[PDB]
Amino acid sequence: AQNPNCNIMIFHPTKEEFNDFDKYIAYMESQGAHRAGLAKIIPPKEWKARETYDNISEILIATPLQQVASGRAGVFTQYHKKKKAMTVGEYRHLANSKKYQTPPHQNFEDLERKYWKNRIYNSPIYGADISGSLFDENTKQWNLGHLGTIQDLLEKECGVVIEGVNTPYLYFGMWKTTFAWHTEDMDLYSINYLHLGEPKTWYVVPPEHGQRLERLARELFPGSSRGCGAFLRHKVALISPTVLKENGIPFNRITQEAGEFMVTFPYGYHAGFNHGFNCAEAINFATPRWIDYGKMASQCSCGEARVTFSMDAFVRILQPERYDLWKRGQD
Numbered sequence: 210a211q212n213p214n215c216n217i218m219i220f221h222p223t224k225e226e227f228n229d230f231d232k233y234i235a236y237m238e239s240q241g242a243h244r245a246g247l248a249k250i251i252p253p254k255e256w257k258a259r260e261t262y263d264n265i266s267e268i269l270i271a272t273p274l275q276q277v278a279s280g281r282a283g284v285f286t287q288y289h290k291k292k293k294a295m296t297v298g299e300y301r302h303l304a305n306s307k308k309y310q311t312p313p314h315q316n317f318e319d320l321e322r323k324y325w326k327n328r329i330y331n332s333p334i335y336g337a338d339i340s341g342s343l344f345d346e347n348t349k350q351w352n353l354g355h356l357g358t359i360q361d362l363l364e365k366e367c368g369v370v371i372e373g374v375n376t377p378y379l380y381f382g383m384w385k386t387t388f389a390w391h392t393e394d395m396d397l398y399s400i401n402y403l404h405l406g407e408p409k410t411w412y413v414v415p416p417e418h419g420q421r422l423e424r425l426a427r428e429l430f431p432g433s434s435r436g437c438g439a440f441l442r443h444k445v446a447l448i449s450p451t452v453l454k455e456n457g458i459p460f461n462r463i464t465q466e467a468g469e470f471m472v473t474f475p476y477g478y479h480a481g482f483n484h485g486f487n488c489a490e491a492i493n494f495a496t497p498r499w500i501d502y503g504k505m506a507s508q509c510s511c512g513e514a515r516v517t518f519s520m521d522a523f524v525r526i527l528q529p530e531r532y533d534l535w536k537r538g539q540d
């Protein structure tokens with residue numbers, strides 16, 4: 210069995226191997242990449258996402274989210290407080306202000322330590338989940354706005370045509386902005402390109418061990434667990450590496466830099482934080498191997514998780530028994 214210790218693998222495709230996205234994902238899997246839950250892909254040196262980032266300041270962040278924490282330094286939840294709209298250029302200035310800028314530090318490790326020690330005492334503002342793309346239309350390779358859609362994959366595998374579309378989202382981050390422990394909707398893959406700015410640190414639990422993380426989370430967030438049998442779908446809970454190690458949960462960590470892709474694999478729980486002002490783009494995708502994960506994915510039916518239009522058909526076709534209860538939570 211390839212990659213049996215479930216380590217995060219890093220790939221360096223040539224320009225020729227960068228042509229066929231599906232083929233390269235399948236290649237990574239042949240080498241065991243999926244066992245980690247997360248892989249890094251460094252594009253060939255010839256490749257570029259676009260010519261420059263000099264003209265992005267007028268993009269609008271209609272609903273910036275202030276991430277307010279509750280709990281203890283290693284075990285906390287976050288809620289999102291909506292703020293007034295601002296442009297990317299306004300957000301970048303805010304991120305660089307004395308209140309929100311990255312502190313002096315020695316290296317990524319020192320910064321990680323400062324994050325875990327101090328995150329809860331601050332409320333950073335995240336420009337997350339903005340529909341759009343920064344890939345130039347002429348970029349032909351690994352262009353997240355031109356991937357095959359999940360609806361087309363389900364149709365190809367299962368023969369059923371369904372409604373829905375699949376488009377990318379932009380994330381504008383600052384120091385301490387945080388993504389809570391989660392897997393993707395319907396335990397899909399995700400792909401994330403860091404377009405510009407400061408790094409993003411990731412933590413991941415191998416898919417084969419995801420239920421260990423779920424059991425710990427039920428213990429650590431006991432009111433939340435009573436409220437919902439899949440509350441990590443709410444994307445609000447954080448658990449530090451120190452706490453995971455204390456409880457024997459297998460995981461790995463890696464830092465993504467500007468110009469790099471990350472791929473998360475079906476049912477690979479992940480969480481992380483941004484080092485300073487940055488812009489990432491991400492989208493969900495599927496392969497034939499995903500179908501069995503989609504069929505088995507947990508669902509939030511308490512009402513909190515509230516998701517996209519396109520999830521309806523996935524539930525309806527892959528999980529018909531769950532459909533009626535799930536839809537009541539959507540309505």
Ligand SMILES: O=C(O)CNC(=O)C(=O)O
Nearest residue numbers: 380388399400401473491
């Ligand atoms: O970048 C972020 O804030 C969160 N991204 C992801 O969870 C992903 O790309 O799957």
Ligand SMILES: [Mg+2]
Nearest residue numbers: 265266267268
């Ligand atoms: Mg602009």
Ligand code: NI
Nearest residue numbers: 392393399479
């Ligand atoms: Ni994700």
Ligand SMILES: [Zn+2]
Nearest residue numbers: 437509511513
């Ligand atoms: Zn729920």
